[PDB]
């Protein structure tokens with residue numbers, strides 16, 4: 001574990017801190033994350049979760065009670081890429097490519113019973129070849145948190161990842177966060193103000209959730225054409241199904257891959273300034 005020379009700190013992960021590093025032994029350049037015991041097992045589980053759109057976990061080093069995770073390294077994250085494309089916007093075909101690749105990754109994970117649980121632009125990594133990859137699966141930003149989590153569901157599903165990805169999809173298109181709440185309640189109310197306060201008609205069981213309160217103000221659902229213009233109907237339709245309140249109504253990654261929005265998907269390459 002002293003076979004790694006640090007080159008720079010590329011992130012302050014929720015869990016710990018992430019470093020760009022190089023293996024003195026195998027010379028490869030990597031991302032090193034400086035982090036109980038079921039941890040060692042579950043994380044270890046993640047090593048065999050290998051897919052082109054999932055950052056590979058290379059090595060797990062437990063030592064000196066200082067768990068080190070060694071990941072494949074990518075030079076840029078989507079957050080920085082969005083900020084750099086803010087003035088011109090990311091071209092739709094690249095938005096579409098990225099969404100499609102991300103859905104492929106999730107459908108893979110989800111098929112193996114792994115959730116990400118904390119998808120955010122910072123956790124999506126891109127390379128020069130037009131690839132995008134899911135990073136840093138969880139075992140401050142609440143902007144991408146699905147409403148069932150905010151309402152106190154402890155046994156949430158793979159649908160929470162579809163929620164987050166839809167929020168990111170929206171942000172790529174409009175160049176502004178869909179629901180930038182700065183508290184849990186603010187986050188929930190921003191969602192309600194836009195998609196309308198949910199009730200038993202559109203979400204059976206919602207008024208029985210642990211943090212649901214009858215006193216929640218009741219907002220009407222906003223015009224969906226108002227939310228992500230000027231995205232086309234293929235796009236809006238896929239996004240609406242990604243943002244269904246009811247987790248069991250929310251589209252699955254696998255079905256999303258079949259939506260007509262991806263009829264003409266291609267794989268462009270971003271112009272990256274590393």
Ligand SMILES: O=C1Nc2ccc(Br)cc2/C1=C1/Nc2ccccc2C1=O
Pocket residue numbers: 010011013018031033055071072073074075076077125135136
């Ligand atoms: O390339 C990486 N692989 C990783 C694996 C796990 C975690 Br956590 C982060 C990263 C990576 C990161 N690469 C970056 C490039 C610019 C800014 C931030 C990051 C990362 O954060």
